[PDB]
Amino acid sequence: LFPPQWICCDIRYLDVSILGKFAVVMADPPWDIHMELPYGTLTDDEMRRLNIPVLQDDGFLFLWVTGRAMELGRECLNLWGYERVDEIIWVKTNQLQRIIHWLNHGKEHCLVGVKGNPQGFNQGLDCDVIVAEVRSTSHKPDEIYGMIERLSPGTRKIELFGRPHNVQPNWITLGNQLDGIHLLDPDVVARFKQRYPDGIISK
Amino acid sequence: NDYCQHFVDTGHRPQNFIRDVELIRLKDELIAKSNTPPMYLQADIEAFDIRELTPKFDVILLEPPLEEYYREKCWTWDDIMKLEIDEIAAPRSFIFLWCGSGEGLDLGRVCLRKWGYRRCEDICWIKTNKNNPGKTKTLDPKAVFQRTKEHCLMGIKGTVDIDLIITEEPEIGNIEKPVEIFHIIEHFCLGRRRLHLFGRDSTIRPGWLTVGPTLTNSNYNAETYASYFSAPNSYLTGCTEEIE
Ligand SMILES: CNc1cc(N2CCC3(CC2)CN(c2cc(F)c(CN4CCC(C)(C)CC4)cc2F)CC(=O)N3)ncn1
């Protein structure tokens, strides 16, 4: 079902096997980057134990990383069964196209992982540099959704650790600040009812 | 405006549209005064005992000739990972490793860890195509996207600038990296023993020892070189006045 869908949940405890298989997975996880952050973080072991492997058979994973997660994210990517085959950077500008520890940081990194043998994708349409304005802090740039749609038009996609501004047609968004459960795909709705007859996810 | 869409529409890379791409002039002038004479040595690093390079270096810039640099002797990451870099780095020292845009972003991190460093910065050389918008890129089989940048990993072992370089893509077969990487490095004021492995005649530079197979001439002498750093000059940063 094409229009946006989402699930308010703790991604640590949701049974993601009810969601089926996706052509693209994207995550901007709350990594423990060993600094004080205004949001709650997942430990390294909680990240490793995330049930990413059940989400795809053949497709691509898009994984935002900063600081020590440049390395830890590569570990999780391989542990979950992906090979890292590309790396997108977003050059952060202002509205006038000027660039916003040892160096000041002008960019953010998104790892691209592949799993299995994806067929029918449009590889090579976009390039691996995004130039866009910081529309809001803590937000990824909307251009990433366009590049993913051109890469895999019309297919099912799932974002982990999304927020309400992130909901998109063709995407199922998971995050703990979403407004309830909004599911329209009849396969997912059935599996959700069966696994969660009282609409509650706990352990 | 969505410059990704625009690149799909026109072939102009999004970085083509970044704009603007005595303050820090004392620095630079202090760097230039501090710099040792340029020194250089022709050597086949494959067949060369790296430990003959003394003294231990404060900064190592490592630029192995990757196969991917020759689209139209290559060094594999197998070869590079077997270099004994830790044998010539000072207990507190820095490394800058050009890793390309493919598997080197992973294997180069393995290398850094293998040699005893941790990555603290990731410097991206972003290549514009303002002069040849109509030149499609021939993709690595595993690529999902057109690759328009190279990464230079900064690593540290022991206890002003931005992490981006933007220039126009060099002509086919030009393997030079942007000279701006030297400015970023020297601006860190990391010490004066600076080694460039796989440099060339065209990269030789004051303040640096350059070592590589295609050098046409040498002037390296380890005793002469060590003498630039004997007391009272052992611990200068490269950014201060010479000691009278
Ligand atoms: C406990 N289990 C959970 C948790 C959970 N979420 C909900 C969403 C979450 C974290 C917790 C998003 N978060 C956040 C904010 C950020 F800046 C970043 C960093 N990144 C870096 C790359 C960038 C492009 C610059 C963009 C920014 C990452 C983040 F994850 C803020 C927030 O408040 N919440 N959802 C379900 N289960």
UniProtKB/Swiss-Prot annotation, chain A:
<feature type="binding site">
    <location>
        <position position="28"/>
    </location>
    <ligand>
        <name>S-adenosyl-L-methionine</name>
    </ligand>
</feature>
<comment type="subunit">
    <text>Heterodimer; heterodimerizes with METTL14 to form an antiparallel heterodimer that constitutes an active methyltransferase. Component of the WMM complex, a N6-methyltransferase complex composed of a catalytic subcomplex, named MAC, and of an associated subcomplex, named MACOM. The MAC subcomplex is composed of METTL3 and METTL14. The MACOM subcomplex is composed of WTAP, ZC3H13, CBLL1/HAKAI, VIRMA, and, in some cases of RBM15 (RBM15 or RBM15B). Interacts with NCBP1/CBP80. Interacts with EIF4E. Interacts with EIF3B.</text>
</comment>
<feature type="site" description="Interaction with METTL14">
    <location>
        <position position="74"/>
    </location>
</feature>
<feature type="binding site">
    <location>
        <begin position="176"/>
        <end position="177"/>
    </location>
    <ligand>
        <name>S-adenosyl-L-methionine</name>
    </ligand>
</feature>
<feature type="binding site">
    <location>
        <position position="140"/>
    </location>
    <ligand>
        <name>S-adenosyl-L-methionine</name>
    </ligand>
</feature>
<feature type="site" description="Interaction with METTL14">
    <location>
        <position position="71"/>
    </location>
</feature>
<feature type="region of interest" description="Gate loop 1">
    <location>
        <begin position="29"/>
        <end position="43"/>
    </location>
</feature>
<feature type="region of interest" description="Interaction with METTL14">
    <location>
        <begin position="97"/>
        <end position="107"/>
    </location>
</feature>
<feature type="region of interest" description="Interphase loop">
    <location>
        <begin position="95"/>
        <end position="106"/>
    </location>
</feature>
<feature type="binding site">
    <location>
        <begin position="163"/>
        <end position="166"/>
    </location>
    <ligand>
        <name>S-adenosyl-L-methionine</name>
    </ligand>
</feature>
<feature type="region of interest" description="Interaction with METTL14">
    <location>
        <begin position="83"/>
        <end position="87"/>
    </location>
</feature>
<feature type="binding site">
    <location>
        <begin position="10"/>
        <end position="11"/>
    </location>
    <ligand>
        <name>S-adenosyl-L-methionine</name>
    </ligand>
</feature>
<comment type="function">
    <text>The METTL3-METTL14 heterodimer forms a N6-methyltransferase complex that methylates adenosine residues at the N(6) position of some RNAs and regulates various processes such as the circadian clock, differentiation of embryonic and hematopoietic stem cells, cortical neurogenesis, response to DNA damage, differentiation of T-cells and primary miRNA processing. In the heterodimer formed with METTL14, METTL3 constitutes the catalytic core.</text>
</comment>
<comment type="similarity">
    <text>Belongs to the MT-A70-like family.</text>
</comment>
<protein>
    <recommendedName>
        <fullName>N(6)-adenosine-methyltransferase catalytic subunit METTL3</fullName>
    </recommendedName>
</protein>
<feature type="region of interest" description="Gate loop 2">
    <location>
        <begin position="134"/>
        <end position="142"/>
    </location>
</feature>
From Swiss-Prot, chain B:
<dbReference type="GO" id="GO:0001734">
    <property type="term" value="F:mRNA m(6)A methyltransferase activity"/>
</dbReference>
<feature type="region of interest" description="Interaction with METTL3">
    <location>
        <begin position="101"/>
        <end position="102"/>
    </location>
</feature>
<keyword id="KW-0694">RNA-binding</keyword>
<dbReference type="GO" id="GO:0005634">
    <property type="term" value="C:nucleus"/>
</dbReference>
<feature type="site" description="Interaction with METTL3">
    <location>
        <position position="109"/>
    </location>
</feature>
<feature type="region of interest" description="Interaction with METTL3">
    <location>
        <begin position="119"/>
        <end position="122"/>
    </location>
</feature>
<comment type="function">
    <text>The METTL3-METTL14 heterodimer forms a N6-methyltransferase complex that methylates adenosine residues at the N(6) position of some mRNAs and regulates the circadian clock, differentiation of embryonic stem cells and cortical neurogenesis. In the heterodimer formed with METTL3, METTL14 constitutes the RNA-binding scaffold that recognizes the substrate rather than the catalytic core. N6-methyladenosine (m6A), which takes place at the 5'-[AG]GAC-3' consensus sites of some mRNAs, plays a role in mRNA stability and processing.</text>
</comment>
<dbReference type="GO" id="GO:0045664">
    <property type="term" value="P:regulation of neuron differentiation"/>
</dbReference>
<dbReference type="GO" id="GO:0016556">
    <property type="term" value="P:mRNA modification"/>
</dbReference>
<dbReference type="GO" id="GO:1901533">
    <property type="term" value="P:negative regulation of hematopoietic progenitor cell differentiation"/>
</dbReference>
<dbReference type="GO" id="GO:0048255">
    <property type="term" value="P:mRNA stabilization"/>
</dbReference>
<feature type="site" description="Interaction with METTL3">
    <location>
        <position position="106"/>
    </location>
</feature>
<dbReference type="GO" id="GO:0036396">
    <property type="term" value="C:RNA N6-methyladenosine methyltransferase complex"/>
</dbReference>
<dbReference type="GO" id="GO:0021861">
    <property type="term" value="P:forebrain radial glial cell differentiation"/>
</dbReference>
<dbReference type="GO" id="GO:0061157">
    <property type="term" value="P:mRNA destabilization"/>
</dbReference>
<dbReference type="GO" id="GO:0019827">
    <property type="term" value="P:stem cell population maintenance"/>
</dbReference>
<comment type="similarity">
    <text>Belongs to the MT-A70-like family.</text>
</comment>
<dbReference type="GO" id="GO:0045727">
    <property type="term" value="P:positive regulation of translation"/>
</dbReference>
<dbReference type="GO" id="GO:0031667">
    <property type="term" value="P:response to nutrient levels"/>
</dbReference>
<dbReference type="GO" id="GO:0005654">
    <property type="term" value="C:nucleoplasm"/>
</dbReference>
<dbReference type="GO" id="GO:0003729">
    <property type="term" value="F:mRNA binding"/>
</dbReference>
<dbReference type="GO" id="GO:0042063">
    <property type="term" value="P:gliogenesis"/>
</dbReference>
